[PDB]
Amino acid sequence: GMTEYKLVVVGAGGVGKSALTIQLIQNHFVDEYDPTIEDSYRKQVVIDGETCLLDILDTAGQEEYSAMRDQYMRTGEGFLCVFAINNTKSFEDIHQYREQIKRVKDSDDVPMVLVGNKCDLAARTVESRQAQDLARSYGIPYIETSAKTRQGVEDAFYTLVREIRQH
Amino acid sequence: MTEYKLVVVGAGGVGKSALTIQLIQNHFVDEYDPTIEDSYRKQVVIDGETCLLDILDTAGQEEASAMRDQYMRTGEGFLCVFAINNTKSFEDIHQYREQIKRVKDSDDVPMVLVGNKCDLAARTVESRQAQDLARSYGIPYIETSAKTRQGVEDAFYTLVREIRQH
Amino acid sequence: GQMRLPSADVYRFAEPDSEENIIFEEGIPIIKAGTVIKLIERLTYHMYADPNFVRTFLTTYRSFCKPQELLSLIIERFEIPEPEPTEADRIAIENGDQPLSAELKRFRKEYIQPVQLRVLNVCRHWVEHHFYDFERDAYLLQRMEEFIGTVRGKAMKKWVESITKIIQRKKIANITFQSSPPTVEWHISRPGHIETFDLLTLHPIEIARQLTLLESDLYRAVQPSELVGSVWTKEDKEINSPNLLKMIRHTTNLTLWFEKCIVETENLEERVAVVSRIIEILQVFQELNNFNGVLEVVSAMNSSPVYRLDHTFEQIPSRQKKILEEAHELSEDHYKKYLAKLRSINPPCVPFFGIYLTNILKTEEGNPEVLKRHGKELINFSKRRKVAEITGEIQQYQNQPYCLRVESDIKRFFENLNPMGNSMEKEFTDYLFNKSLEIEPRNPKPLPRFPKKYSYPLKSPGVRPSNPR
Ligand SMILES: Cc1cc(Cn2c(N3CCNCC3)nc3c(N4CCC[C@H]4CN)cc(Cl)cc32)cc(C)c1F
Ligand SMILES: Nc1nc2c(ncn2[C@@H]2O[C@H](COP(=O)(O)OP(=O)(O)NP(=O)(O)O)[C@@H](O)[C@H]2O)c(=O)[nH]1
Ligand SMILES: [Cl-]
Ligand SMILES: [Cl-]
Ligand SMILES: [Cl-]
Ligand SMILES: [Cl-]
Ligand SMILES: [Mg+2]
Ligand code: NA
Fold this sequence. Notes:
The structure holds three protein chains of three kinds. Chain A has a single domain, classed as P-loop containing nucleotide triphosphate hydrolases (Rossmann fold, 3-Layer(aba) Sandwich), CATH 3.40.50. Chain A is 32% helix and 26% strand. Chain A has helices at residues 19-25, 69-73, 88-92, 94-105, 128-138, 153-165; strands at residues 3-11, 42-47, 50-58, 78-84, 112-118, 142-146. In chain A, helix 5 (128-138) links the parallel strand 5 and strand 6. Chain C has 21 helices and four strands. A four-stranded antiparallel sheet of chain C has the order 1-2-4-3. Classes of the chains: A alpha/beta, B alpha/beta, C mainly alpha. The A-C interface holds A 13-14, 16, 18-19, 22, 26, 31-36, 38, 41, 57-68, 70-71, 74, 96, 100, 103-104, 106 and C 230, 232-235, 237, 245, 248-249, 251-252, 255-256, 259, 295, 298-300, 302-304, 307-308, 331, 334, 336, 354, 357-363, 365-368, 386, 390, 425-426, 433. The structure holds ligand FVG, phosphoaminophosphonic acid-guanylate ester, chloride ion (4 copies), magnesium ion and sodium ion. Residues 12-18, 29-30, 32, 34-35, 59-61, 116-117, 119-120, 145-147 of chain B line the site of phosphoaminophosphonic acid-guanylate ester. Chain B: GO terms for molecular function: G protein activity; GDP binding; GTP binding; GTPase activity; phospholipase C activator activity; protein-membrane adaptor activity. Chain B: This is GTPase HRas.
């Protein structure tokens, strides 16, 4: 029936990456979660008037299993590359995540978005202009999100779906 | 996976905890640390069916004797343990049997009679006397050693079969 | 009627339950949220024991209460005032008679003694299963030793003396089986010739057995203190989660070793033998319920350097393609078949830890620390119960030992495995991918030929065990 998009979230650990998918798939208006629940990572949405099913893989917490990255990434059609705006190292990691995705997918043009995540009130160290410049150099969109207010979360996932649809 | 709530009861020092830890960890505990209440879980395939055993290990010391109704209400089946070198622990069995029946308001509660410490030569309770008691209750009698593992799986898994068939 | 209680002014744990201090989930009650005072009251409740709650609380409480404060609170819980004589007792005493003290005796038997025993059970579980609090705070240990060592009165004496001994044993701190382990199996490498040990010269059965013993030991060593609070993801992860990280780094090294064995075997026929041997090891991992091992192999075969080796794939026997495909199917649909298989097998097993880590992290990130109700902040205990359900599952699979004999030299070989050498991760995984491109170039570049590198027979001895008398 409706199209299912397999999305994969990648990025450094320990800096709130998991809040992106939790806030999306959540009961938006009840701050609660059981990730063990079958299809706590599947969500039917309407994007530009077209209903589809998002299947989101977020292996947050498994970052030390670095030799499993290919196994996980191979499942995906589009990728959210996430860094924290108060963690410069996580921003510097983005280049290698993108290179690894290109290699797994055997393509120079994989649907992907760059996401800068605000995970606390600690001082921002990556300015939006730096991240915009990086995204432009890659030819991909940039979305900033809050890990607390849900701002930007729908835009991040919907923009990625549009990237897949327009590939 | 069906879940089974087993409760191990009997006089202080008969080996309830040693039996349970042998089942759970394949280890024999030499120390005698009196239990207040401990609980364990074990996934195991019995007669081709996977289940999850919740095992409640209870206090045998008489100072805890007023706190039993609460665990007898929740248990599905009971291992009634005495030690074959302690006649007093065998005489205490009928008090546990009667209390379980009262609390669960049932004459038909899954139970197994366990004579533990069967590795020791100096027996004071003869198998026949225990078997006669078990027959009067309608339940099997299994002799065990928490030290050697003799009969340990048989005791616990027979109780599971009793609950299954209940 | 119900027993009367001490005045809440002299004993804080007698405040009535209300929605301002405890909330229950919709035959003992399950707590959704409460003040720390109410959680401790129910942890040590006079009407029933709740061993699951004791484990849940002691595993997770540091997110809402400091260890020093917990000890102060349970000592306060323990010190229960006794009621004054009743009117009937007074009249007896005024006549020179001994009072019946019926209400006092009932309160001792049905309130004080169960609450005090359940406080001691918390202390006992705390010392036996969560002793790290005391290892990290010597003053906390002194306070516990003093509290236990000064409990008076004969009703508690057996457990006070026992807990005192347990503490002293923990400060200065054997398996029996239903049958004998199978005989250790040898192939080209013979016992004591560690210099020849390699993927194809050790027996594939024994490779799988010794890796399973190693991976089982690594799995069994991970304590809940390495997991609660998501501490393995934070800046101090090497301090707080060392056994977990050692376990993960072993898994990563084995996956990279499999990839390295494959792509450094440049001759096609030899590389087919290497891959075939790895899938045989995977088969034995499956037989042993070593799911960590299964996924180590699957991750290697799905890696970018190996996945693209179509000429190697073409020569793998159909039956072995099927073994690998069914192993990969365990991971599909968010590990649906893996989860069902783990829950159906007869242990011992070695679970894959990664799923637990993601579920703990998302449970802690996706639920609030407190619930606000009637102007009060209540501890969200349901969130902690969910974390402790995961740590309890982990612990349940840590109990059962494997009935397999250690081979000390093979164990040392796999403990010391270091496929990356002195190279950094990026340089090494780039090296593996460039080797892949060398041995099977991208179309339309022609496929080169390469000389053999192994001087010994490539035929596998198979994975069915042997048994001499
Ligand atoms: C046996 C073997 C397998 C692979 C690599 N590989 C391939 N390849 C597709 C591209 N052509 C090459 C083969 N498919 C899979 C696979 N899929 C899951 C569903 C079914 C199958 C379809 N993708 C799972 C896993 Cl884990 C490994 C897979 C490389 C070498 C060297 C091998 F010897
Ligand atoms: N020889 C032998 N000793 C045993 C056996 N089972 C238990 N013991 C010993 O008997 C003592 C009491 O064991 P324990 O398991 O603590 O008994 P318990 O019934 O749990 N006691 P409590 O009711 O106070 O909790 C320990 O020293 C233990 O090693 C057995 O099968 N053989
Ligand atoms: Cl839209
Ligand atoms: Cl996910
Ligand atoms: Cl357990
Ligand atoms: Cl190596
Ligand atoms: Mg005991
Ligand atoms: Na920074």
